[PDB]
């Protein structure tokens, strides 16, 4: 239902191919959802450089998952400007992979320290996107959902749907009854299983 959808603009996949997505059992799947502007969608990938891939959301190089992004100008656009989707503009070091940093401490860009008060060389790290309906493509909101597939030693909790077919009786047919492989003739019986 995800691969066959058409509204998705970018559906590049890295560790797995979309064809065999259903035939792969994973321990856990993480769905990370955020909204970024159009030009920054290229930075959501393993081994990429940018403000949105160093200060906000960083993907590890050994990434086993998919990235899905679709334009949402209609969903997120205010006549005066959204002013509600914000990104971390200033940080003193790059993020570790799959790390979330939520802090409002003032970025000290000068010699004189500031004790949480803005001023000269002391700026708020968090800045707000300006989203407006009149904005052209590339500065328009894009909703990104990053699916990360995890494979631990725990039993594979998530598996793809197991399709089947109809039941034919009184005929020598091959059968696969929930993992039992064999050949024979299936007839109704009066055995009383527990």
């Amino acid at each position, epitope marked *: 239902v995800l691969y066959n959808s058409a509204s998705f603009s970018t559906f590049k996949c890295y560790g797995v191919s979309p064809t065999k997505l259903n035939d792969l059992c994973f321990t856990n799947v993480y769905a990370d959802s955020f909204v970024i502007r159009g030009d920054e969608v290229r930075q959501i990938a393993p081994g990429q450089t940018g403000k949105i891939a160093d200060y906000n959301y960083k993907l590890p190089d050994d990434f086993t998952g998919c990235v899905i992004a679709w334009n949402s100008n209609n969903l997120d656009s205010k006549v005066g400007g*959204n002013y509600n989707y914000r990104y971390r503009l200033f940080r003193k070091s790059n993020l570790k992979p799959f790390e979330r940093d939520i802090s409002t401490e003032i970025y000290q860009a000068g010699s004189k320290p500031c004790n949480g008060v803005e001023g000269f060389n002391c700026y708020f790290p968090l800045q707000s996107y300006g989203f407006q309906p009149t904005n052209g493509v590339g500065y328009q909101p894009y909703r990104v959902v990053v699916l990360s597939f995890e494979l631990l030693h725990a039993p594979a909790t998530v598996c793809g749907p197991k399709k089947d077919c109809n039941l034919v009786k009184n005929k020598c047919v091959n059968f696969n009854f929930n993992g039992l492989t064999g050949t024979g003739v299936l007839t109704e019986s009066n055995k009383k299983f527990l």
Partner: antibody, heavy 121, light 107 residues
């Protein structure tokens, strides 16, 4: 002065279809998301439907889903709300309002006057 | 689906009185709740949005608060224009549900 003008509603036999128009004036109809709100006599305000600014992303309420259909014409600066499978419980006055966000983060800043639809025998 | 349940069905007060009206949410809506003024025979006018703000046009006498499941509006300078029905609408999910209302009488 910014105003909203609405019309196209009236007494209609049950089982037919009614299409209402909410004309826009004083603003850019191609940059706002429109909402439909109805109120039965002696009742509260019930949400009906919403359409995005570009007219390609619409949601209806949990009562008139599937039956009601909403549309818009930015060139004509009017709203096209088409009712299908009209039922006798839709006797209410319908209001068309204006919101900045299709999800109405800060919308519902201007309203019109409303038109009354009374369906009966 | 989240329904809005205003506990005060109606309030009795006179001009220049202090009353509080509360609205309750079944689920957790962060701050996406708005208030409206509905004079009978007219269209509803917004006076609180985002659960704490002042609409450009109304006097700075409607003070809304609350976050999560409870939302309360406080007025301390009630005027003859404060006798109408008030509704609370949530904007967390696409189905938007208004409130039952609250009539303000003259006593």
């Amino acid at each position: 002065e910014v105003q909203l003008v609405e019309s196209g509603g009236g007494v209609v036999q049950p089982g037919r279809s009614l299409r209402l128009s909410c004309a826009a004036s004083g603003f850019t109809f191609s940059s706002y998301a429109m909402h439909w709100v109805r109120q039965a006599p002696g009742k509260g305000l019930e949400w009906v439907a919403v359409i995005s600014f570009d007219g390609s992303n619409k949601y209806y309420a949990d009562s008139v889903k599937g039956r009601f259909t909403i549309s818009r014409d930015n060139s004509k600066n009017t709203l096209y709300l088409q009712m299908n499978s009209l039922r006798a419980e839709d006797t209410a006055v319908y209001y068309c309002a204006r919101a900045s966000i299709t999800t109405t983060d800060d919308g519902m800043d201007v309203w019109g006057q409303g038109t009354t639809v009374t369906v009966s025998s | 689906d989240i329904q809005m349940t205003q506990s005060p069905s109606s309030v009795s007060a006179s001009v220049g009185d202090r009353v509080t009206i509360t609205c309750r949410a079944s689920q957790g809506i962060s701050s996406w709740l708005a208030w409206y003024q509905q004079k009978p025979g007219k269209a509803p006018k917004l006076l609180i949005y985002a659960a704490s703000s002042l609409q450009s046009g109304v006097p700075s006498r409607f003070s809304g608060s609350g976050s999560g499941t409870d939302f309360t509006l406080t007025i301390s300078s009630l005027q003859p224009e404060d006798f109408a029905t008030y509704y609370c609408q949530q904007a967390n999910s696409f189905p938007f549900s208004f409130g039952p209302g609250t009539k303000v009488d003259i006593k």
